[PDB]
Design an enzyme around this catalytic site. Sequence first.
Site, mmCIF file in Angstrom:
data_model
loop_
_atom_site.group_PDB
_atom_site.id
_atom_site.type_symbol
_atom_site.label_atom_id
_atom_site.label_comp_id
_atom_site.label_asym_id
_atom_site.label_seq_id
_atom_site.Cartn_x
_atom_site.Cartn_y
_atom_site.Cartn_z
ATOM 1 N N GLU A 1 -22.287 -10.831 -35.847
ATOM 2 C CA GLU A 1 -22.517 -11.005 -37.274
ATOM 3 C C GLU A 1 -21.188 -11.221 -38.015
ATOM 4 O O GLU A 1 -21.123 -12.023 -38.940
ATOM 5 C CB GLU A 1 -23.275 -9.811 -37.867
ATOM 6 N N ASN B 1 -25.707 -17.523 -48.267
ATOM 7 C CA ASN B 1 -26.879 -18.145 -47.668
ATOM 8 C C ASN B 1 -27.296 -19.336 -48.513
ATOM 9 O O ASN B 1 -26.989 -19.399 -49.696
ATOM 10 C CB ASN B 1 -28.027 -17.138 -47.559
ATOM 11 N N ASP C 1 -30.098 -19.865 -49.919
ATOM 12 C CA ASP C 1 -30.931 -19.455 -51.044
ATOM 13 C C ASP C 1 -30.103 -18.851 -52.180
ATOM 14 O O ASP C 1 -30.656 -18.561 -53.252
ATOM 15 C CB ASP C 1 -32.054 -18.498 -50.610
ATOM 16 N N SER D 1 -28.297 -16.010 -51.958
ATOM 17 C CA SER D 1 -27.936 -14.662 -51.575
ATOM 18 C C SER D 1 -26.678 -14.715 -50.704
ATOM 19 O O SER D 1 -26.241 -15.784 -50.311
ATOM 20 C CB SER D 1 -29.059 -13.966 -50.870
ATOM 21 N N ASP E 1 -24.436 -12.401 -47.552
ATOM 22 C CA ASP E 1 -24.458 -11.368 -46.528
ATOM 23 C C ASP E 1 -23.104 -10.677 -46.516
ATOM 24 O O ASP E 1 -22.075 -11.361 -46.608
ATOM 25 C CB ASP E 1 -24.686 -11.962 -45.144
ATOM 26 N N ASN F 1 -27.905 -8.497 -46.379
ATOM 27 C CA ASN F 1 -28.256 -9.571 -47.299
ATOM 28 C C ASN F 1 -28.596 -9.000 -48.690
ATOM 29 O O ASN F 1 -29.399 -8.085 -48.799
ATOM 30 C CB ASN F 1 -29.469 -10.346 -46.736
#
Lengths: 129, 129
Positions: free
Chosen positions: A35, A46, A48, A50, A52, A59
């Site tokens: 990750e 991301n 959308d 958002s 992380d 998220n």
Amino acid sequence: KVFGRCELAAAMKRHGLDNYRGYSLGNWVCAAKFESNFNTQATNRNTDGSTDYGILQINSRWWCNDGRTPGSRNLCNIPCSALLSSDITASVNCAKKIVSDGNGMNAWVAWRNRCKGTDVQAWIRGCRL
Amino acid sequence: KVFGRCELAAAMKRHGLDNYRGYSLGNWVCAAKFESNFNTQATNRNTDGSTDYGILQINSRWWCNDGRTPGSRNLCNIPCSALLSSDITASVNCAKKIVSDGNGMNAWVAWRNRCKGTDVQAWIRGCRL
Ligand code: VO4
Ligand code: VO4
Ligand SMILES: [Cl-]
Ligand SMILES: [Cl-]
Ligand SMILES: [Cl-]
Ligand SMILES: [Cl-]
Ligand SMILES: [Cl-]
Ligand SMILES: [Cl-]
Ligand code: NA
Ligand code: NA
């Protein structure tokens, strides 16, 4: 902070992730490797809108507040900035909520694709635990 | 830093003191309680002009350099200031040399008088280790 592998394994064990919800410690080290490459300050935006955050790339769509993810939730009741600290406590505590929430470690795409089903004990070998 | 009991037990275990030279973890927690009350910044001046430093009150007569203990040694090859850090590594590493040096934990007067022979497991009860 960028953790070494065994360093992070010990910290994760100190924080009670070993066997948490039945996931052995090497699952959690593997997930963190893929990750974030063990970097508490990792962030990725991301599609959308958002973001992380942190060593397990949690998220803002669901789990933390960053003030810039319209329509999102904050299910861990924390600022997303807390997930970037050198102290992994906030990340671990929020990860425990995520993994308890129905889909287990499948919530982490990198875990599902790269760790699940593999020899995850390799991630803790050579480490004093 | 002033440690809580279980917090220090975990740190000491992380640093390999559990069963080091055959001394169970509760010996080391007990010694730290009575030497320093778990305070990494504890200092006390001895009658001879040496000073004791840190969570295990390591003496500048033999083990560390403070620049003000004439005729002394520095067998841990460290400034005494390093033994006052919030990070207990230097203290632990120097304690491992001390306990390996012939008299075991008897080097700590408070251990001999207050911990030796007692139920030292009490010092780690209730702690996640
Ligand atoms: O960069 V994120 O696609 O893992 O939610
Ligand atoms: O204050 V010291 O007497 O323990 O060496
Ligand atoms: Cl995270
Ligand atoms: Cl928001
Ligand atoms: Cl599961
Ligand atoms: Cl010390
Ligand atoms: Cl000196
Ligand atoms: Cl001995
Ligand atoms: Na949010
Ligand atoms: Na000295």
